[PDB]
Amino acid sequence: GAMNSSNYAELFNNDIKLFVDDTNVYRVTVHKTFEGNVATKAINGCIFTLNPKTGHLFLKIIHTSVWAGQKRLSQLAKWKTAEEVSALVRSLPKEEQPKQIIVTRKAMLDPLEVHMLDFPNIAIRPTELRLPFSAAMSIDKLSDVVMKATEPQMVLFNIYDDWLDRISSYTAFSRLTLLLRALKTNEESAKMILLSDPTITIKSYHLWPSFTDEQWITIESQMRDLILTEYGRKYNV
Amino acid sequence: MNTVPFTSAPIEVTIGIDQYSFNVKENQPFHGIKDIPIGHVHVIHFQHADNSSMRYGYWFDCRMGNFYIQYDPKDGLYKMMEERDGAKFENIVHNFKERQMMVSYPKIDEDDTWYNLTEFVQMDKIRKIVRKDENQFSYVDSSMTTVQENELSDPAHSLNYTVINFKSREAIRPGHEMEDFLDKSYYLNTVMLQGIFKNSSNYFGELQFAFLNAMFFGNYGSSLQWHAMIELICSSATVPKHMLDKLDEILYYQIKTLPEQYSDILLNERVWNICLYSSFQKNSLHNTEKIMENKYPELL
Ligand SMILES: COC(=O)CNC(=O)c1ccccc1Cl
Numbered sequence: 284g285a286m287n288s289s290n291y292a293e294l295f296n297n298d299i300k301l302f303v304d305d306t307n308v309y310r311v312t313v314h315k316t317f318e319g320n321v322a323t324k325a326i327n328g329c330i331f332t333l334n335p336k337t338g339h340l341f342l343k344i345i346h347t348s349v350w351a352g353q354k355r356l357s358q359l360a361k362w363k364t365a366e367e368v369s370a371l372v373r374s375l376p377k378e379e380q381p382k383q384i385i386v387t388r389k390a391m392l393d394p395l396e397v398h399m400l401d402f403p404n405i406a407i408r409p410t411e412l413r414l415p416f417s418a419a420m421s422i423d424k425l426s427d428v429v430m431k432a433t434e435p436q437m438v439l440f441n442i443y444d445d446w447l448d449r450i451s452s453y454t455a456f457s458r459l460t461l462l463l464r465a466l467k468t469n470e471e472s473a474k475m476i477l478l479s480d481p482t483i484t485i486k487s488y489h490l491w492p493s494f495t496d497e498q499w500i501t502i503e504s505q506m507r508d509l510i511l512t513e514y515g516r517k518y519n520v
Numbered sequence: 521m522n523t524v525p526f527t528s529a530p531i532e533v534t535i536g537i538d539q540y541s542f543n544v545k546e547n548q549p550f551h552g553i554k555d556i557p558i559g560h561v562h563v564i565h566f567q568h569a570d571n572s573s574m575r576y577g578y579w580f581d582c583r584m585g586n587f588y589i590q591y592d593p594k595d596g597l598y599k600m601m602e603e604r605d606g607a608k609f610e611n612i613v614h615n616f617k618e619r620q621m622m623v624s625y626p627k628i629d630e631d632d633t634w635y636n637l638t639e640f641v642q643m644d645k646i647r648k649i650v651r652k653d654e655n656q657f658s659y660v661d662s663s664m665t666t667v668q669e670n671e672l673s674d675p676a677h678s679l680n681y682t683v684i685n686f687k688s689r690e691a692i693r694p695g696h697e698m699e700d701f702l703d704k705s706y707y708l709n710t711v712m713l714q715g716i717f718k719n720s721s722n723y724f725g726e727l728q729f730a731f732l733n734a735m736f737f738g739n740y741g742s743s744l745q746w747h748a749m750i751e752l753i754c755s756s757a758t759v760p761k762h763m764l765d766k767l768d769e770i771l772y773y774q775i776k777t778l779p780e781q782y783s784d785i786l787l788n789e790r791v792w793n794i795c796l797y798s799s800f801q802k803n804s805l806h807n808t809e810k811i812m813e814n815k816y817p818e819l820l
Pocket residue numbers: 339340341439440441
Protein backbone atom coordinates (compact mmCIF):
# COMPACT_ATOMS: atom_id res chain seq x y z
CA GLY A 284 0.00 0.00 0.00
CA ALA A 285 1.25 3.47 0.96
CA MET A 286 4.98 3.94 1.49
CA ASN A 287 5.90 5.49 4.86
CA SER A 288 8.40 5.51 7.75
CA SER A 289 7.40 2.00 8.84
CA ASN A 290 8.56 0.39 5.55
CA TYR A 291 11.46 2.69 4.62
CA ALA A 292 14.13 -0.01 4.14
CA GLU A 293 11.99 -1.53 1.39
CA LEU A 294 13.37 1.21 -0.90
CA PHE A 295 16.82 -0.40 -0.79
CA ASN A 296 15.92 -4.08 -1.21
CA ASN A 297 16.49 -5.93 -4.49
CA ASP A 298 12.99 -5.49 -6.00
CA ILE A 299 13.32 -2.91 -8.78
CA LYS A 300 11.29 0.21 -8.01
CA LEU A 301 10.91 3.74 -9.28
CA PHE A 302 9.80 6.99 -7.69
CA VAL A 303 7.88 9.26 -10.06
CA ASP A 304 7.62 12.96 -9.21
CA ASP A 305 5.46 15.14 -11.48
CA THR A 306 5.89 18.50 -9.64
CA ASN A 307 8.04 20.02 -12.38
CA VAL A 308 6.19 18.73 -15.43
CA TYR A 309 3.94 21.78 -16.01
CA ARG A 310 5.78 24.98 -15.07
CA VAL A 311 4.60 28.55 -15.75
CA THR A 312 5.42 32.17 -15.13
CA VAL A 313 2.32 34.28 -14.33
CA HIS A 314 2.37 37.82 -15.77
CA LYS A 315 0.18 40.81 -16.64
CA THR A 316 -1.21 41.35 -20.14
CA PHE A 317 -1.22 44.70 -21.91
CA GLU A 318 -4.93 45.00 -21.01
CA GLY A 319 -4.07 44.37 -17.36
CA ASN A 320 -5.35 40.79 -17.25
CA VAL A 321 -3.22 37.88 -16.06
CA ALA A 322 -1.82 35.16 -18.31
CA THR A 323 0.63 32.27 -17.98
CA LYS A 324 3.67 31.44 -20.09
CA ALA A 325 4.82 27.84 -19.86
CA ILE A 326 8.49 26.94 -19.61
CA ASN A 327 10.16 23.59 -20.14
CA GLY A 328 9.53 20.97 -17.48
CA CYS A 329 10.62 17.49 -16.57
CA ILE A 330 9.43 14.17 -15.11
CA PHE A 331 11.70 13.02 -12.24
CA THR A 332 11.81 9.19 -12.33
CA LEU A 333 14.34 7.77 -9.90
CA ASN A 334 15.60 4.30 -8.88
CA PRO A 335 16.42 4.89 -5.17
CA LYS A 336 18.64 1.79 -4.99
CA THR A 337 20.92 2.55 -7.95
CA GLY A 338 20.61 6.31 -8.28
CA HIS A 339 19.36 6.12 -11.91
CA LEU A 340 17.35 9.37 -12.71
CA PHE A 341 15.39 8.92 -16.05
CA LEU A 342 14.72 12.71 -16.59
CA LYS A 343 12.13 13.10 -19.40
CA ILE A 344 12.33 16.78 -20.44
CA ILE A 345 8.79 18.16 -21.20
CA HIS A 346 9.05 20.74 -23.94
CA THR A 347 6.53 23.61 -23.96
CA SER A 348 5.29 22.54 -27.41
CA VAL A 349 3.45 19.64 -25.77
CA TRP A 350 0.98 22.16 -24.26
CA ALA A 351 0.23 24.04 -27.48
CA GLY A 352 -3.51 24.23 -28.10
CA GLN A 353 -4.36 22.11 -25.10
CA LYS A 354 -6.85 22.84 -22.32
CA ARG A 355 -6.85 22.00 -18.61
CA LEU A 356 -3.05 21.77 -18.58
CA SER A 357 -2.62 20.86 -14.90
CA GLN A 358 -4.83 17.80 -15.50
CA LEU A 359 -3.20 16.95 -18.81
CA ALA A 360 0.22 17.15 -17.12
CA LYS A 361 -0.67 14.20 -14.88
CA TRP A 362 -1.77 12.07 -17.87
CA LYS A 363 1.26 13.12 -19.94
CA THR A 364 3.45 12.05 -16.99
CA ALA A 365 1.68 8.70 -16.85
CA GLU A 366 2.02 8.23 -20.64
CA GLU A 367 5.78 8.94 -20.52
CA VAL A 368 6.37 6.62 -17.51
CA SER A 369 4.43 3.81 -19.23
CA ALA A 370 6.47 4.40 -22.42
CA LEU A 371 9.70 4.22 -20.36
CA VAL A 372 8.70 0.94 -18.73
CA ARG A 373 7.79 -0.54 -22.12
CA SER A 374 11.18 0.52 -23.48
CA LEU A 375 13.04 -1.35 -20.72
CA PRO A 376 13.96 -5.04 -20.98
CA LYS A 377 11.63 -7.21 -18.91
CA GLU A 378 14.28 -7.93 -16.29
CA GLU A 379 14.81 -4.15 -15.84
CA GLN A 380 11.14 -3.20 -15.54
CA PRO A 381 10.10 -2.11 -12.02
CA LYS A 382 7.95 -4.26 -9.79
CA GLN A 383 6.61 -1.12 -8.05
CA ILE A 384 6.20 2.53 -9.07
CA ILE A 385 5.82 4.94 -6.13
CA VAL A 386 4.19 8.32 -6.99
CA THR A 387 5.04 11.28 -4.80
CA ARG A 388 1.58 12.85 -5.28
CA LYS A 389 -1.67 10.88 -4.95
CA ALA A 390 -3.28 12.53 -7.99
CA MET A 391 -0.85 10.52 -10.15
CA LEU A 392 -2.33 7.20 -8.97
CA ASP A 393 -5.31 6.95 -11.34
CA PRO A 394 -3.52 8.34 -14.44
CA LEU A 395 -0.61 5.93 -13.94
CA GLU A 396 -2.82 2.96 -13.07
CA VAL A 397 -4.85 3.43 -16.29
CA HIS A 398 -1.74 3.81 -18.45
CA MET A 399 -0.22 0.67 -16.89
CA LEU A 400 -3.25 -1.62 -17.29
CA ASP A 401 -1.08 -3.75 -19.59
CA PHE A 402 1.23 -4.36 -16.57
CA PRO A 403 -1.05 -5.87 -13.92
CA ASN A 404 1.92 -7.14 -11.90
CA ILE A 405 3.49 -3.66 -11.45
CA ALA A 406 2.16 -2.12 -8.24
CA ILE A 407 1.31 1.60 -8.30
CA ARG A 408 1.76 3.03 -4.79
CA PRO A 409 1.45 6.37 -3.00
CA THR A 410 3.77 7.47 -0.22
CA GLU A 411 3.25 9.31 3.05
CA LEU A 412 6.82 10.65 2.92
CA ARG A 413 7.12 14.33 1.93
CA LEU A 414 9.98 13.95 -0.49
CA PRO A 415 11.79 17.04 -1.72
CA PHE A 416 12.10 16.01 -5.37
CA SER A 417 10.56 19.29 -6.57
CA ALA A 418 13.97 20.81 -5.75
CA ALA A 419 15.56 18.82 -8.61
CA MET A 420 15.47 21.96 -10.73
CA SER A 421 17.78 23.56 -8.16
CA ILE A 422 20.53 21.21 -9.33
CA ASP A 423 22.40 23.33 -11.85
CA LYS A 424 23.17 20.70 -14.47
CA LEU A 425 19.59 19.34 -14.42
CA SER A 426 18.07 22.81 -14.70
CA ASP A 427 20.44 23.63 -17.56
CA VAL A 428 19.54 20.61 -19.70
CA VAL A 429 15.77 21.24 -19.15
CA MET A 430 15.88 24.93 -20.08
CA LYS A 431 18.07 24.38 -23.15
CA ALA A 432 15.90 21.65 -24.67
CA THR A 433 14.38 22.55 -28.03
CA GLU A 434 12.46 19.26 -28.36
CA PRO A 435 11.25 16.43 -26.12
CA GLN A 436 14.39 14.64 -24.85
CA MET A 437 15.26 12.06 -22.11
CA VAL A 438 18.46 12.98 -20.05
CA LEU A 439 20.08 9.93 -18.31
CA PHE A 440 21.64 11.06 -14.91
CA ASN A 441 22.91 9.04 -11.85
CA ILE A 442 21.88 11.37 -9.00
CA TYR A 443 24.34 9.79 -6.50
CA ASP A 444 27.44 10.46 -8.65
CA ASP A 445 29.94 7.76 -7.43
CA TRP A 446 28.74 7.74 -3.83
CA LEU A 447 27.73 4.05 -3.92
CA ASP A 448 31.42 3.12 -4.26
CA ARG A 449 31.79 4.27 -0.65
CA ILE A 450 28.31 4.23 0.98
CA SER A 451 25.12 2.20 0.95
CA SER A 452 22.00 3.18 -0.98
CA TYR A 453 20.20 3.91 2.28
CA THR A 454 22.89 6.46 3.17
CA ALA A 455 23.02 7.83 -0.39
CA PHE A 456 19.28 8.37 -0.46
CA SER A 457 19.41 10.05 2.96
CA ARG A 458 22.14 12.39 1.71
CA LEU A 459 20.19 13.21 -1.45
CA THR A 460 16.97 13.95 0.44
CA LEU A 461 18.87 16.16 2.89
CA LEU A 462 20.54 18.09 0.06
CA LEU A 463 17.25 18.52 -1.75
CA ARG A 464 15.27 19.48 1.35
CA ALA A 465 17.90 22.19 2.00
CA LEU A 466 17.80 23.48 -1.55
CA LYS A 467 14.01 23.59 -1.26
CA THR A 468 13.95 25.48 2.04
CA ASN A 469 16.64 28.05 1.22
CA GLU A 470 18.22 27.57 -2.20
CA GLU A 471 20.71 30.45 -1.92
CA SER A 472 22.14 29.28 1.40
CA ALA A 473 22.21 25.63 0.30
CA LYS A 474 24.16 26.48 -2.85
CA MET A 475 26.54 28.72 -0.88
CA ILE A 476 27.27 25.75 1.39
CA LEU A 477 27.96 23.42 -1.51
CA LEU A 478 30.29 25.77 -3.43
CA SER A 479 31.86 28.09 -0.84
CA ASP A 480 35.28 26.39 -1.18
CA PRO A 481 36.68 26.82 -4.73
CA THR A 482 39.11 23.89 -4.35
CA ILE A 483 36.26 21.32 -4.23
CA THR A 484 35.01 20.93 -7.78
CA ILE A 485 32.21 19.11 -9.58
CA LYS A 486 33.50 16.55 -12.04
CA SER A 487 32.32 17.03 -15.60
CA TYR A 488 30.39 13.73 -15.32
CA HIS A 489 28.89 14.47 -11.84
CA LEU A 490 26.14 16.63 -10.39
CA TRP A 491 27.54 17.37 -6.92
CA PRO A 492 31.03 18.31 -5.66
CA SER A 493 33.76 15.74 -5.08
CA PHE A 494 33.68 15.82 -1.28
CA THR A 495 35.80 13.58 0.86
CA ASP A 496 33.99 11.48 3.44
CA GLU A 497 35.00 14.02 6.11
CA GLN A 498 33.84 16.99 4.05
CA TRP A 499 30.47 15.29 3.44
CA ILE A 500 29.95 15.07 7.20
CA THR A 501 30.73 18.78 7.46
CA ILE A 502 28.45 19.50 4.49
CA GLU A 503 25.64 17.33 5.85
CA SER A 504 25.85 19.08 9.22
CA GLN A 505 25.69 22.48 7.52
CA MET A 506 22.53 21.42 5.63
CA ARG A 507 20.82 20.29 8.83
CA ASP A 508 21.74 23.63 10.47
CA LEU A 509 20.22 25.47 7.48
CA ILE A 510 17.02 23.46 7.68
CA LEU A 511 16.65 24.05 11.41
CA THR A 512 17.56 27.75 11.04
CA GLU A 513 14.93 28.31 8.33
CA TYR A 514 12.52 26.40 10.54
CA GLY A 515 13.22 29.00 13.25
CA ARG A 516 13.20 32.01 10.91
CA LYS A 517 9.93 30.60 9.57
CA TYR A 518 8.13 29.87 12.85
CA ASN A 519 10.19 32.27 15.04
CA VAL A 520 11.70 29.78 17.55
CA MET B 521 -55.57 -11.34 -12.53
CA ASN B 522 -53.39 -14.29 -11.38
CA THR B 523 -52.81 -16.04 -8.09
CA VAL B 524 -49.97 -17.56 -6.08
CA PRO B 525 -51.62 -20.36 -3.43
CA PHE B 526 -49.60 -21.15 -0.30
CA THR B 527 -49.95 -24.69 0.97
CA SER B 528 -49.80 -23.29 4.44
CA ALA B 529 -47.92 -20.84 6.68
CA PRO B 530 -46.22 -22.97 9.35
CA ILE B 531 -43.73 -20.34 10.56
CA GLU B 532 -44.33 -16.69 11.38
CA VAL B 533 -43.07 -14.58 8.49
CA THR B 534 -43.35 -11.16 6.92
CA ILE B 535 -44.32 -11.67 3.27
CA GLY B 536 -43.77 -8.95 0.71
CA ILE B 537 -45.16 -8.75 -2.83
CA ASP B 538 -43.33 -5.97 -4.85
CA GLN B 539 -43.33 -2.76 -2.64
CA TYR B 540 -46.09 -4.11 -0.27
CA SER B 541 -45.32 -6.04 2.99
CA PHE B 542 -47.66 -7.95 5.40
CA ASN B 543 -47.21 -10.17 8.52
CA VAL B 544 -48.46 -13.82 8.77
CA LYS B 545 -48.60 -15.50 12.17
CA GLU B 546 -47.35 -19.01 12.88
CA ASN B 547 -49.94 -21.52 11.58
CA GLN B 548 -52.30 -18.73 10.53
CA PRO B 549 -54.88 -19.86 7.91
CA PHE B 550 -53.14 -18.12 5.03
CA HIS B 551 -53.31 -19.60 1.54
CA GLY B 552 -51.76 -16.99 -0.68
CA ILE B 553 -52.07 -13.89 -2.82
CA LYS B 554 -54.72 -13.18 -5.46
CA ASP B 555 -55.46 -10.43 -8.03
CA ILE B 556 -51.80 -10.15 -9.10
CA PRO B 557 -51.55 -7.84 -12.13
CA ILE B 558 -50.76 -9.55 -15.37
CA GLY B 559 -48.15 -7.94 -17.59
CA HIS B 560 -45.38 -7.31 -15.11
CA VAL B 561 -42.76 -9.38 -13.42
CA HIS B 562 -43.31 -9.71 -9.69
CA VAL B 563 -41.31 -10.67 -6.62
CA ILE B 564 -42.61 -12.50 -3.57
CA HIS B 565 -40.22 -12.29 -0.64
CA PHE B 566 -39.83 -13.44 2.89
CA GLN B 567 -38.37 -12.50 6.24
CA HIS B 568 -38.82 -14.94 9.07
CA ALA B 569 -39.91 -13.53 12.41
CA ASP B 570 -37.45 -15.65 14.37
CA ASN B 571 -34.39 -15.00 12.17
CA SER B 572 -34.33 -11.69 10.32
CA SER B 573 -31.10 -13.06 8.80
CA MET B 574 -31.64 -13.86 5.13
CA ARG B 575 -34.34 -12.01 3.32
CA TYR B 576 -35.04 -14.23 0.29
CA GLY B 577 -37.60 -14.36 -2.49
CA TYR B 578 -38.64 -15.33 -6.00
CA TRP B 579 -38.96 -13.35 -9.22
CA PHE B 580 -41.76 -14.68 -11.42
CA ASP B 581 -44.25 -13.87 -14.20
CA CYS B 582 -47.65 -15.57 -13.94
CA ARG B 583 -47.86 -15.69 -17.74
CA MET B 584 -45.10 -18.32 -17.70
CA GLY B 585 -46.75 -20.93 -15.50
CA ASN B 586 -48.82 -21.68 -12.41
CA PHE B 587 -46.70 -21.08 -9.32
CA TYR B 588 -47.36 -21.75 -5.61
CA ILE B 589 -45.47 -21.51 -2.31
CA GLN B 590 -44.85 -24.40 0.07
CA TYR B 591 -42.81 -24.35 3.26
CA ASP B 592 -40.01 -26.94 3.40
CA PRO B 593 -39.27 -27.94 7.03
CA LYS B 594 -35.96 -29.56 6.08
CA ASP B 595 -34.39 -26.58 4.31
CA GLY B 596 -36.32 -24.18 6.52
CA LEU B 597 -37.77 -21.88 3.91
CA TYR B 598 -40.80 -21.04 1.83
CA LYS B 599 -40.14 -22.47 -1.65
CA MET B 600 -41.72 -21.53 -4.93
CA MET B 601 -42.86 -24.44 -7.07
CA GLU B 602 -44.55 -24.86 -10.45
CA GLU B 603 -47.84 -26.90 -10.65
CA ARG B 604 -47.94 -28.49 -14.16
CA ASP B 605 -51.51 -29.88 -13.73
CA GLY B 606 -53.58 -26.88 -14.77
CA ALA B 607 -56.98 -28.18 -13.66
CA LYS B 608 -55.69 -29.23 -10.26
CA PHE B 609 -54.27 -25.71 -9.86
CA GLU B 610 -57.42 -23.86 -10.93
CA ASN B 611 -59.39 -26.03 -8.52
CA ILE B 612 -57.08 -25.37 -5.61
CA VAL B 613 -57.18 -21.61 -6.24
CA HIS B 614 -60.98 -21.58 -6.64
CA ASN B 615 -61.45 -23.42 -3.30
CA PHE B 616 -59.13 -21.02 -1.45
CA LYS B 617 -60.81 -18.01 -3.00
CA GLU B 618 -64.24 -19.37 -2.01
CA ARG B 619 -62.99 -19.77 1.58
CA GLN B 620 -61.48 -16.22 1.41
CA MET B 621 -58.11 -17.54 2.54
CA MET B 622 -56.07 -15.41 0.14
CA VAL B 623 -55.03 -11.73 0.64
CA SER B 624 -55.58 -9.36 -2.32
CA TYR B 625 -52.72 -7.58 -4.25
CA PRO B 626 -53.76 -4.05 -3.09
CA LYS B 627 -53.09 -2.09 -6.29
CA ILE B 628 -54.52 1.50 -6.01
CA ASP B 629 -55.86 2.31 -9.48
CA GLU B 630 -54.04 5.68 -9.80
CA ASP B 631 -50.79 3.97 -8.85
CA ASP B 632 -48.14 3.26 -11.47
CA THR B 633 -45.27 2.66 -9.01
CA TRP B 634 -44.66 -0.99 -9.87
CA TYR B 635 -44.82 -0.42 -13.62
CA ASN B 636 -42.40 2.47 -13.18
CA LEU B 637 -39.91 0.33 -11.25
CA THR B 638 -40.07 -2.68 -13.62
CA GLU B 639 -40.68 -0.96 -17.00
CA PHE B 640 -37.67 -2.63 -18.70
CA VAL B 641 -37.41 -5.74 -16.50
CA GLN B 642 -38.17 -9.01 -18.31
CA MET B 643 -38.21 -12.53 -16.87
CA ASP B 644 -35.99 -13.87 -19.62
CA LYS B 645 -33.21 -11.45 -18.67
CA ILE B 646 -33.64 -12.13 -14.96
CA ARG B 647 -33.12 -15.82 -15.74
CA LYS B 648 -29.76 -15.06 -17.39
CA ILE B 649 -28.58 -13.05 -14.36
CA VAL B 650 -29.91 -15.78 -12.01
CA ARG B 651 -29.02 -19.17 -13.50
CA LYS B 652 -31.28 -22.09 -12.49
CA ASP B 653 -32.69 -23.24 -15.78
CA GLU B 654 -34.98 -26.02 -14.52
CA ASN B 655 -37.29 -23.39 -12.98
CA GLN B 656 -39.29 -20.57 -14.61
CA PHE B 657 -38.87 -18.37 -11.53
CA SER B 658 -35.67 -17.02 -9.96
CA TYR B 659 -34.51 -17.20 -6.33
CA VAL B 660 -32.52 -14.33 -4.83
CA ASP B 661 -31.43 -13.60 -1.26
CA SER B 662 -29.51 -11.17 0.93
CA SER B 663 -26.20 -13.06 0.81
CA MET B 664 -25.83 -13.95 -2.90
CA THR B 665 -22.65 -12.53 -4.41
CA THR B 666 -22.08 -11.24 -7.91
CA VAL B 667 -19.67 -12.57 -10.53
CA GLN B 668 -17.54 -9.43 -10.14
CA GLU B 669 -17.54 -9.85 -6.34
CA ASN B 670 -16.27 -13.44 -6.77
CA GLU B 671 -13.39 -12.19 -8.96
CA LEU B 672 -12.11 -9.94 -6.13
CA SER B 673 -17.37 -18.28 -4.02
CA ASP B 674 -19.99 -20.78 -5.28
CA PRO B 675 -20.70 -19.92 -8.95
CA ALA B 676 -24.08 -21.70 -9.20
CA HIS B 677 -25.54 -19.28 -6.61
CA SER B 678 -24.18 -16.04 -8.10
CA LEU B 679 -25.77 -12.94 -9.59
CA ASN B 680 -24.30 -12.74 -13.11
CA TYR B 681 -24.69 -9.03 -13.62
CA THR B 682 -22.71 -7.45 -16.44
CA VAL B 683 -19.24 -6.60 -15.11
CA ILE B 684 -18.46 -2.87 -15.19
CA ASN B 685 -14.98 -1.72 -14.21
CA PHE B 686 -13.77 1.79 -15.00
CA LYS B 687 -10.07 0.86 -14.71
CA SER B 688 -10.08 -2.10 -17.07
CA ARG B 689 -8.88 -2.72 -20.58
CA GLU B 690 -12.51 -3.19 -21.61
CA ALA B 691 -13.22 0.37 -20.47
CA ILE B 692 -10.07 2.03 -21.82
CA ARG B 693 -8.92 2.12 -25.45
CA PRO B 694 -5.13 1.84 -25.85
CA GLY B 695 -3.95 5.34 -26.64
CA HIS B 696 -7.18 6.93 -25.40
CA GLU B 697 -6.38 6.52 -21.71
CA MET B 698 -7.15 10.03 -20.53
CA GLU B 699 -10.01 10.50 -22.97
CA ASP B 700 -11.79 7.29 -22.08
CA PHE B 701 -11.24 7.55 -18.31
CA LEU B 702 -12.53 11.11 -18.02
CA ASP B 703 -15.35 10.63 -20.61
CA LYS B 704 -16.85 7.16 -20.49
CA SER B 705 -18.94 7.56 -23.71
CA TYR B 706 -16.95 4.92 -25.60
CA TYR B 707 -17.49 2.38 -22.86
CA LEU B 708 -21.18 3.24 -22.45
CA ASN B 709 -22.14 3.47 -26.11
CA THR B 710 -19.81 1.09 -27.96
CA VAL B 711 -18.76 -1.52 -25.44
CA MET B 712 -21.88 -1.84 -23.31
CA LEU B 713 -24.86 -0.55 -25.34
CA GLN B 714 -23.88 -1.65 -28.86
CA GLY B 715 -21.69 -4.58 -27.82
CA ILE B 716 -23.16 -6.24 -24.73
CA PHE B 717 -26.69 -5.02 -24.00
CA LYS B 718 -27.67 -4.37 -27.66
CA ASN B 719 -30.04 -1.56 -26.63
CA SER B 720 -30.82 0.82 -23.77
CA SER B 721 -33.93 -1.13 -22.76
CA ASN B 722 -31.83 -4.15 -21.72
CA TYR B 723 -29.38 -1.83 -19.90
CA PHE B 724 -32.20 -0.16 -18.00
CA GLY B 725 -33.74 -3.55 -17.23
CA GLU B 726 -30.57 -4.77 -15.53
CA LEU B 727 -30.25 -1.41 -13.73
CA GLN B 728 -33.82 -1.69 -12.41
CA PHE B 729 -33.41 -5.34 -11.39
CA ALA B 730 -30.23 -4.50 -9.50
CA PHE B 731 -31.96 -1.69 -7.59
CA LEU B 732 -34.90 -3.92 -6.68
CA ASN B 733 -32.62 -6.69 -5.37
CA ALA B 734 -30.73 -4.08 -3.35
CA MET B 735 -33.93 -2.65 -1.86
CA PHE B 736 -35.86 -5.83 -1.20
CA PHE B 737 -33.05 -8.13 -0.04
CA GLY B 738 -30.34 -5.75 1.11
CA ASN B 739 -28.13 -7.35 -1.53
CA TYR B 740 -24.89 -5.38 -1.35
CA GLY B 741 -23.48 -6.48 -4.72
CA SER B 742 -26.74 -5.52 -6.40
CA SER B 743 -26.45 -2.06 -4.86
CA LEU B 744 -22.90 -1.83 -6.25
CA GLN B 745 -24.18 -2.77 -9.72
CA TRP B 746 -27.03 -0.22 -9.63
CA HIS B 747 -24.63 2.61 -8.73
CA ALA B 748 -22.07 1.51 -11.33
CA MET B 749 -24.67 1.58 -14.09
CA ILE B 750 -25.83 5.06 -13.02
CA GLU B 751 -22.28 6.34 -12.80
CA LEU B 752 -21.39 4.98 -16.27
CA ILE B 753 -24.18 7.04 -17.84
CA CYS B 754 -23.55 10.18 -15.78
CA SER B 755 -19.79 10.03 -16.55
CA SER B 756 -20.42 9.91 -20.33
CA ALA B 757 -20.42 13.23 -22.17
CA THR B 758 -22.36 11.72 -25.06
CA VAL B 759 -25.62 9.93 -24.22
CA PRO B 760 -28.79 9.73 -26.38
CA LYS B 761 -31.30 12.32 -25.19
CA HIS B 762 -34.04 9.71 -24.82
CA MET B 763 -31.82 7.65 -22.52
CA LEU B 764 -31.16 10.64 -20.25
CA ASP B 765 -34.84 11.51 -20.03
CA LYS B 766 -35.74 7.91 -19.29
CA LEU B 767 -32.95 7.58 -16.70
CA ASP B 768 -34.29 10.61 -14.82
CA GLU B 769 -37.74 8.94 -14.64
CA ILE B 770 -36.25 5.61 -13.59
CA LEU B 771 -34.20 7.05 -10.74
CA TYR B 772 -37.01 9.34 -9.64
CA TYR B 773 -39.31 6.39 -8.93
CA GLN B 774 -36.51 4.39 -7.29
CA ILE B 775 -35.67 7.27 -4.96
CA LYS B 776 -39.39 7.83 -4.33
CA THR B 777 -39.88 4.20 -3.34
CA LEU B 778 -36.76 3.76 -1.21
CA PRO B 779 -37.57 3.49 2.51
CA GLU B 780 -36.41 6.67 4.19
CA GLN B 781 -34.69 4.70 6.96
CA TYR B 782 -32.57 2.65 4.49
CA SER B 783 -30.96 5.60 2.71
CA ASP B 784 -27.79 5.35 4.83
CA ILE B 785 -26.93 1.86 3.51
CA LEU B 786 -28.57 1.84 0.06
CA LEU B 787 -27.28 5.18 -1.30
CA ASN B 788 -23.63 5.88 -2.08
CA GLU B 789 -22.81 9.51 -1.24
CA ARG B 790 -19.91 9.67 -3.69
CA VAL B 791 -21.81 8.40 -6.71
CA TRP B 792 -24.83 10.62 -6.14
CA ASN B 793 -22.94 13.83 -5.44
CA ILE B 794 -20.73 13.20 -8.48
CA CYS B 795 -23.72 12.35 -10.68
CA LEU B 796 -25.95 15.24 -9.64
CA TYR B 797 -23.36 18.00 -9.16
CA SER B 798 -20.05 17.24 -10.97
CA SER B 799 -20.76 14.87 -13.86
CA PHE B 800 -21.44 15.59 -17.51
CA GLN B 801 -25.13 14.93 -16.80
CA LYS B 802 -25.30 17.11 -13.66
CA ASN B 803 -28.00 19.17 -15.45
CA SER B 804 -29.88 16.31 -17.13
CA LEU B 805 -31.64 14.71 -14.15
CA HIS B 806 -34.08 17.40 -12.98
CA ASN B 807 -36.71 15.13 -11.49
CA THR B 808 -34.16 12.96 -9.68
CA GLU B 809 -32.22 15.97 -8.36
CA LYS B 810 -35.38 17.62 -7.03
CA ILE B 811 -36.60 14.53 -5.15
CA MET B 812 -33.11 13.77 -3.83
CA GLU B 813 -32.73 17.32 -2.48
CA ASN B 814 -36.15 17.34 -0.78
CA LYS B 815 -35.93 13.81 0.64
CA TYR B 816 -32.21 13.22 1.34
CA PRO B 817 -30.57 16.66 1.65
CA GLU B 818 -28.25 15.19 4.31
CA LEU B 819 -26.55 12.78 1.90
CA LEU B 820 -25.74 15.83 -0.25
C1 LIG C 1 23.45 6.55 -21.83
O1 LIG C 1 23.18 5.18 -21.61
C2 LIG C 1 23.17 4.64 -20.34
O2 LIG C 1 22.96 3.47 -20.37
C3 LIG C 1 23.43 5.43 -19.02
N1 LIG C 1 23.97 4.56 -17.97
C4 LIG C 1 23.32 4.31 -16.78
O3 LIG C 1 23.77 3.59 -15.90
C5 LIG C 1 22.02 5.00 -16.68
C6 LIG C 1 20.98 4.51 -17.42
C7 LIG C 1 19.73 5.12 -17.39
C8 LIG C 1 19.53 6.21 -16.61
C9 LIG C 1 20.59 6.70 -15.88
C10 LIG C 1 21.81 6.10 -15.93
CL1 LIG C 1 23.09 6.85 -15.10
